[PDB]
Design a protein around this ligand. Structure first.
Ligand SMILES: CCNC(=O)c1noc(-c2cc(Cl)c(O)cc2O)c1-c1ccc(CN2CCOCC2)cc1
Ligand SMILES: CCNC(=O)c1noc(-c2cc(Cl)c(O)cc2O)c1-c1ccc(CN2CCOCC2)cc1
Lengths: 208, 208
């Protein structure tokens, strides 16, 4: 099953900076992730325009936000384009090694961590709140994989045999002990209404 | 040489709204276009990571801004991924038909035209200043094309036999009579310093 890779050295600094820096405006991790879903959904819609059967694996394009106080996870599910195992290994389809240089350069010269998405490494903002992020994803041209890391230098990539999903990506956020506010329905509706009000796909906040 | 297509009916409304609406903060067309370059450069860098020879058609990734008071054009040149003729026909690789619905919905309910990029139809902001936009583009898997429209319902797509470019996209903006401020070096440096200060590729403002 499991393979264990090392984060590129600059990404590992990024994550460390994100875990360590005192910084109180954490709610943005959501914007970043929903806004990744949105991009993922854009692409499958772009692709469907010319091949309408690429949409065979789900004809409806949406984001669901699924809280679970018990398991202590927030899960964002979308039915976008998905990634290949190769994409997941290559920094979740980002240009991370260079976005971290840009971002890094930006931080000591003014910028604050909210600006992270502007460098296309918005994903790692996940680590403002999650002590463990598992990314489950299915692309049309591949098996369903699972990506996982609790940070500290290395991530993992098993092919997944959990619940098939047809197409999209699913980010389970195993939340930090003191970060459980982002499982409260009040708080999530707030953050989405504040920061993701212009996302052109429906966003369904599940209720427990 | 030339083929003549019709804008999808909703895009044609978009452009008409952009030409007609009284709206004084026009300088944003630049942000939109440079920020399209940036995305185009991201992709060829993403692609080079796994195939480093895709970069054979230019190993350096950048944006040049080239003013010409004489011809009355502003030209933005980048060496990003480029588009296929199929991409250019399909709304310059956007999901325009739906981004215009989202945008449209947003406008009557608060939003102003600066928010256009958030709907992935930021290109048309070009028509806040250009009376004619010509897009010249070369992808690795195709000939160099030219896209053109002065709006009014229809655009054009010739294969291009002007100056080869290796790889990227080039948007010549044939500027409106009273919109020549965006050929002044003062003004362009301003708009870029204000709105495109965090673009992770060099931006070279040519001098006349
Ligand atoms: C290669 C083709 N597939 C995709 O790009 C894809 N499929 O699924 C996702 C994705 C990624 C993440 Cl982190 C999510 O939280 C959700 C999601 O759908 C993605 C994304 C991966 C990465 C990114 C981040 N960017 C890619 C380039 O940098 C600008 C933003 C957005 C979406
Ligand atoms: C299909 C693969 N190729 C490309 O995507 C590409 N190559 O070159 C460009 C491009 C487009 C425009 Cl309008 C420019 O001004 C510059 C440029 O490089 C592009 C772009 C086309 C369209 C867009 C607009 N978006 C695409 C999806 O919506 C979010 C932003 C950005 C870049």
């Amino acid at each position: 099953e499991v393979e264990t890779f090392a984060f590129q050295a600059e990404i590992a600094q990024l994550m460390s900076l994100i875990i360590n820096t005192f910084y109180s405006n954490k709610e943005i991790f959501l914007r970043e992730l929903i806004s990744n879903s949105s991009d993922a959904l854009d692409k499958i819609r772009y692709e469907s325009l010319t091949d309408p059967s690429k949409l065979d694996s789900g004809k409806e394009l949406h984001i669901n936000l699924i809280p679970n106080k018990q398991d202590r996870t927030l899960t964002i599910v979308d039915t976008g384009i998905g990634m290949t195992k190769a994409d997941l290994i290559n920094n979740l389809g980002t240009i991370a090694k260079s976005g971290t240089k840009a971002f890094m350069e930006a931080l000591q010269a003014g910028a604050d961590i909210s600006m992270i998405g502007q460098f296309g490494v918005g994903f790692y903002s996940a680590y403002l709140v999650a002590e463990k992020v598992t990314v489950i994803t299915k692309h049309n041209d591949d098996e369903q994989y699972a990506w996982e890391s609790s940070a500290g230098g290395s991530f993992t990539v098993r092919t997944d045999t959990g619940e098939p999903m047809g197409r999209g990506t699913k980010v389970i956020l195993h939340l930090k002990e003191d970060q459980t506010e982002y499982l409260e329905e009040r708080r999530i509706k707030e953050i989405v209404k504040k920061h993701s009000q212009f996302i052109g796909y429906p966003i369904t906040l599940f209720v427990e």
